[PDB]
Paper text:
To simulate GI bleeding, we utilized an injection-based microfluidics device and found that femtoliter volumes of human serum are sufficient to induce bacterial attraction to the serum source. This response is orchestrated through chemotaxis and the chemoattractant L-serine, an amino acid abundant in serum that is recognized through direct binding by the chemoreceptor Tsr. The full-length Tsr protein includes a periplasmic ligand-binding domain (LBD), a transmembrane HAMP domain, and a cytosolic coiled-coil region, which oligomerizes to form trimers-of-dimers, and complexes with the downstream chemotaxis signaling components, CheA and CheW. We report the first crystal structures of Salmonella Typhimurium Tsr in complex with L-serine and identify a conserved amino acid recognition motif for L-serine shared among Tsr orthologues. The biological distribution of Tsr reveals the chemoreceptor to be widely conserved among Gammaproteobacteria, particularly within the families Enterobacteriaceae, Morganelliaceae, and Yersiniaceae.
To capture a complex with a fully bound ligand site, we grew crystals of the soluble periplasmic portion of the SeTsr LBD with L-serine, at a high salt concentration that would serve as a cryoprotectant without further manipulation, and harvested crystals directly from drops to prevent leaching of the ligand from the binding site. The crystal structure of SeTsr LBD contains five monomers in the asymmetric unit, providing five independent views of the L-serine binding site, with homodimers formed between chains A and B, C and D, and E and its crystal symmetry mate, E′. Lower B-factors in the SeTsr ligand binding region are indicative of greater order, reflecting that our structure is fully serine-bound. SeTsr and EcTsr possess high-sequence similarity in the LBD region—100% identity of the ligand-binding residues and 82.1% identity over the entire periplasmic domain—and as expected, retain a similar global structure with all chains of serine-bound SeTsr, serine-bound EcTsr, and apo EcTsr overlaying within 0.24 Ǻ rmsd over 139 Cα. The higher resolution (+0.3 Ǻ) of the SeTsr structure, and full occupancy of the ligand, provides a much-improved view of the interactions that facilitate specific recognition of L-serine. All five chains of the SeTsr structure are consistent in the positions of the ligand and surrounding residues. Consequently, we can conclude that the correct serine pose and ligand-binding site positions for both models are those we determined using the higher resolution SeTsr structure, in which the L-serine side chain hydroxyl faces outward from the pocket, toward the solvent, and every hydrogen bonding group of the ligand is satisfied by the residues of the binding site.
Numbering used by the authors:
A (entry chain A): 42 to 182
B (entry chain B): 42 to 181
The structure:
């Protein structure tokens, strides 16, 4: 019934949320890394933050596969799902590369990566996909 | 009645998302701020990021008022809403404080603010609130 899109919706939202939480944690580690260069570091360490980003990026993978493996209503759009996955893989892959750049100390290459564009592209599909499902709500009446 | 729920969940989830983006942009600005002090600045500038964070923090405040104005079903717990609002106000106000600290060059107070705890507290209520509406959706 209409419960199969609400459960598929919740699964993709949890991926969306974990991607954002991962990007934020990485940028915290960037500040601490910067602080350590000038020996003014305090609070959370780079290692603890990198450790947390690694965890939430794996959580992101697992949340994604949980959404992929959920059944799709025949009315939904196949192209829509492929565009979601295309933008997700770029965004997820970009965060994985940010972990490597920071570990190698490439702070400029880290900061200059156009992560915002990858995120904007995924959010554009998520929003459009949220709208098409909200319409299946309005017509399932 | 079921439509009333999906509207609330979407309005509150939009606030949740905007809070996360606001915090991330502020942490991007913190890096560039430190880059400027070390003369290795590149990418997005502090000013552009600060005006982005200022922008998204207003989207958060608006997205919240949209959720708060939507009608609450009687079956929904009033105390649950008060706890969502309490944790939201702490979290929002904390992000507003980060804008003041970074604009004042206070990078240590900026980094040391326990923002994670404010976010964890709001996410705890947000998760509990959704699981309740989901069980409510199941009954109907
Ligand atoms: Cl570099
Ligand atoms: Cl970009
Ligand atoms: Cl300070
Ligand atoms: Cl904390
Ligand atoms: Na939403
Ligand atoms: Na500076
Ligand atoms: Na910019
Ligand atoms: Na309050």
């Amino acid at each position: 019934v209409l419960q199969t899109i609400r459960q598929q919706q919740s699964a993709l939202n949890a991926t969306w949320v974990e991607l954002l939480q991962t990007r934020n944690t990485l940028n915290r580690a960037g500040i601490r890394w910067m602080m350590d260069q000038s020996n003014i570091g305090s609070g959370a360490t780079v290692a603890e933050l990198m450790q947390g980003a690694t965890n939430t990026l794996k959580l992101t993978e697992k949340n994604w596969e949980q959404y992929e493996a959920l059944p799709r209503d025949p009315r939904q759009s196949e192209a829509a799902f492929l565009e979601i996955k295309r933008t997700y893989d770029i965004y997820h892959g970009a965060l994985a590369e940010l972990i490597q750049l920071l570990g190698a100390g490439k702070i400029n290459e880290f900061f200059d990566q156009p992560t915002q564009s990858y995120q904007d592209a995924f959010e554009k599909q998520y929003m459009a996909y949220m709208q098409q499902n909200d319409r299946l709500y309005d017509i399932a009446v």
